[PDB]
Amino acid sequence: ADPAAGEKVFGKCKACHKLDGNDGVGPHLNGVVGRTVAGVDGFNYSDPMKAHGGDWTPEALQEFLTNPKAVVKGTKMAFAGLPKIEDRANLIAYLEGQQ
Numbered sequence: 001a002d003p004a005a006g007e008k009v010f011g012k013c014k015a016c017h018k019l020d021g022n023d024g025v026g027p028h029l030n031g032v033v034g035r036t037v038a039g040v041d042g043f044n045y046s047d048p049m050k051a052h053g054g055d056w057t058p059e060a061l062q063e064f065l066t067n068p069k070a071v072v073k074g075t076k077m078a079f080a081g082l083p084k085i086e087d088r089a090n091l092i093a094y095l096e097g098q099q
């Protein structure tokens, strides 16, 4: 529920993701909440990500951020994970503000 704290957590995402609409190592994350999984046109998603389906609901996002490869096995997103539920919740709150 704390976007200010979530903003700090995003420091762990900025190396590959932007919130300005630009795509790089990873797709832009501004507007990601509720967004179609593998829904950014032009971005070269892995096959498992494209086969996943569904939307990036708060629950799907929080699980994915805890362990990317457990949620989308074979994803090309190389990230250790956020083991603290508060960090995940705060980060999601922050992203929701950038919808």
Ligand code: HEC
Binding pocket: 009, 010, 012, 013, 014, 015, 016, 017, 025, 026, 027, 029, 032, 036, 037, 038, 039, 040, 044, 045, 046, 048, 049, 056, 061, 065, 074, 075, 076, 077, 078, 079, 082
């Ligand atoms: C680069 C080393 C990354 C870091 C650090 C984080 N992410 Fe990432 N992410 C990256 C790639 C290469 C991809 C594509 C994965 C694939 O298999 O195709 C992604 C993807 C995501 C997605 C899905 C986006 C979509 O449009 O479907 C999400 C929701 C996402 N990444 C979130 C995320 C956050 C919040 C991070 C910091 C905690 C984070 N990523 C770090 C590469 C990298």
